[PDB]
Amino acid sequence: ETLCGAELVDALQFVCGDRGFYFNKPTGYGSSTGIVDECCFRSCDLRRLEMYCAPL
């Protein structure tokens, strides 16, 4: 059981609330896949899903 398309967006809107979400985690400067790969093509748990919520 995975989350794809609208189901995936519904889950993110519910879990992230008003924070917003991204499909790929930004890399940021001086740093040393995405949610579709982790949660739609593959099954992911709530903890991993919430990691795609933007910051407060």
Ligand X SMILES: C[C@H](CCC(=O)N(CCCNC(=O)[C@H](O)[C@@H](O)[C@H](O)[C@H](O)CO)CCCNC(=O)[C@H](O)[C@@H](O)[C@H](O)[C@H](O)CO)[C@H]1CC[C@H]2[C@@H]3CC[C@@H]4C[C@H](O)CC[C@]4(C)[C@H]3C[C@H](O)[C@]12C
Q: Which parts of this chain interact with Br ion (CB under 5 A)?
A: 22-24
**Residues between 9 and 48 with contacts to ligand X, criterion CB under 6 A:** 10-11, 14-15, 43, 45-46
Nearer to Br ion, 24 or 33 (CB): 24
Q: Please state, in angstroms and rounded to a whole number, the distance separating the CA atoms of residues 4 and 48.
A: 15
Nearer to ligand X, 14 or 29 (CB): 14
Q: Does 1 engage in binding with ligand X (CB under 6 A)? A: yes
Q: Count other C-beta atoms under 10 Å from residue 52's C-beta.
A: 22
Place of tokens 């008003």: 18
> What DSSP designation does 37 have?
I
